Ligand binder design. Structure first.
Ligand SMILES: [Ca+2]
Ligand SMILES: [Ca+2]
Ligand SMILES: [Ca+2]
Ligand SMILES: [Ca+2]
Ligand SMILES: [Ca+2]
Ligand SMILES: [Ca+2]
Ligand SMILES: [Ca+2]
Ligand SMILES: [Cl-]
Ligand SMILES: [Zn+2]
Lengths: 320, 65
């Protein structure tokens, strides 16, 4: 297979990721991003070095087998490559191109997913490879270097149901200090699907290369991000261009990874997650809000949410 | 059978309860007091009433965006 020379997708350059790399590419050892999706092409040349853990929760059975964790769809590999494709001579590059990834396969060969499997996926992101959320009992989970919990949960998926046990699990992730990001959905609907609709979760809408919201993007997102004509990694060891709020999501998850990476590199702790409301520089979500490129009507609006995330500003604000 | 998720009081519920009404245990969450269970359709009524059982919710489907 003939690997093409590296290019930087227009989305990466829109969310202002490249100027951050000299500070961090996200390869701070305590930082992992868990991507709950169709799995990953774990051997892809532009992804493999960053795949820290590969696991599946399909049908309520947790498997660490590689065969069970492999992407049979493509959607996972595409998403992961937007966050984390390696900065090198080949392919594309991710927003956080040195960040460690946990690929948690909660969606099948068809891209279909049960809420029970997703919930187990969230659970595995918290527990991490060692099966234990908080091994030393200190209450610090995300950002504790003694633990292996992810710091970001990325969910390019959603549905119409709002279920109490799924919400309870989201609550657990929030209280573990994990930033949760999820796709608004692609029905052109009035509001986001779940879990993007939960207050603890960042809802993400899709813009196109002209900076207009995509007509399919579910409205009332918290932030927005490149979601039309997005080139990324794709099976098997190749690339593909896709659209959807599924492609916007990982841009935002990458920016959060850059923020917590930068902040930990400097201070030896991570930022609090924050709320949808937050307009301070003291939490991840407030930083994301106040540094977003306010598009559309002034301030937060039903199309763009607070705006297009901008990593270079967000990190400068985190470190200031 | 259908897949449901039962939220429970752990120290009041015991997994062996479900086999009596036709159920089997799929997965016991480690971080929330909940349990994924396969039950026959006609038996969901029976699950609702067991000791330690706070809630029964059906297993829903996500849409790939
Ligand atoms: Ca970690
Ligand atoms: Ca590359
Ligand atoms: Ca752990
Ligand atoms: Ca700990
Ligand atoms: Ca600790
Ligand atoms: Ca491959
Ligand atoms: Ca606006
Ligand atoms: Cl509750
Ligand atoms: Zn069964």
């Amino acid at each position: 297979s003939t690997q093409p020379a590296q290019t930087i997708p227009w989305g990466i350059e829109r969310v202002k990721a490249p100027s951050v790399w000299s500070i961090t590419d996200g390869s701070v050892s305590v930082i992992q991003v868990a991507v709950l999706d169709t799995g990953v092409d774990y051997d892809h040349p532009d992804l493999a070095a960053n795949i820290a853990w590969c696991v599946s929760t399909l049908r309520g059975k947790v498997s660490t087998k590689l065969r069970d964790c492999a992407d049979q769809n493509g959607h996972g590999t595409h998403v992961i490559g937007t966050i984390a494709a390696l900065n090198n001579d080949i392919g594309v590059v991710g927003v956080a191109p040195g960040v460690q990834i946990y690929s948690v396969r909660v969606l099948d060969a068809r891209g279909s997913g049960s809420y029970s499997d997703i919930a187990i996926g969230i659970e595995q992101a918290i527990l991490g490879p060692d099966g234990v959320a908080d091994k030393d009992g200190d209450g610090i989970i995300a950002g504790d270097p003694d633990d292996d919990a992810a710091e970001v949960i990325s969910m390019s998926l959603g549905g119409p149901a709002d279920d109490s046990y799924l919400y309870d699990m989201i609550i657990q992730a929030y209280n573990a200090g994990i930033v949760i990001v999820a796709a608004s959905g692609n029905e052109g609907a009035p509001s986001p699907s779940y879990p993007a609709a939960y207050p603890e979760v960042i809802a993400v809408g899709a813009i196109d290369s002209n900076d207009n919201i995509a007509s399919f993007s579910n409205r009332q997102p918290e932030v927005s991000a490149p979601g039309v004509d997005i080139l990324s990694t794709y099976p098997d060891d190749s690339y593909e261009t896709l659209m959807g709020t599924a492609m916007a999501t990982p841009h935002v998850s990458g920016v959060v990874a850059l923020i917590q990476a930068a902040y930990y590199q400097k201070y030896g702790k991570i930022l609090p997650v924050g709320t949808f409301d937050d307009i301070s520089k003291n939490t991840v979500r407030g930083i994301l809000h106040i540094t977003a490129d306010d598009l559309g009507p002034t301030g937060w609006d039903a199309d763009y949410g607070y705006g297009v995330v901008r990593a270079a500003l967000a990190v400068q604000a985190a470190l200031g | 059978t259908i897949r449901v998720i039962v939220s429970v009081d752990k120290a009041k519920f015991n997994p062996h309860e479900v086999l009596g009404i036709g159920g089997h245990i799929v997965y016991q969450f480690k971080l929330i007091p909940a349990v994924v269970v396969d039950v026959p359709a006609n038996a969901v009524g029976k699950l609702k009433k067991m000791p330690g059982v706070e809630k029964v919710e059906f297993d829903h489907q996500a849409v790939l965006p």
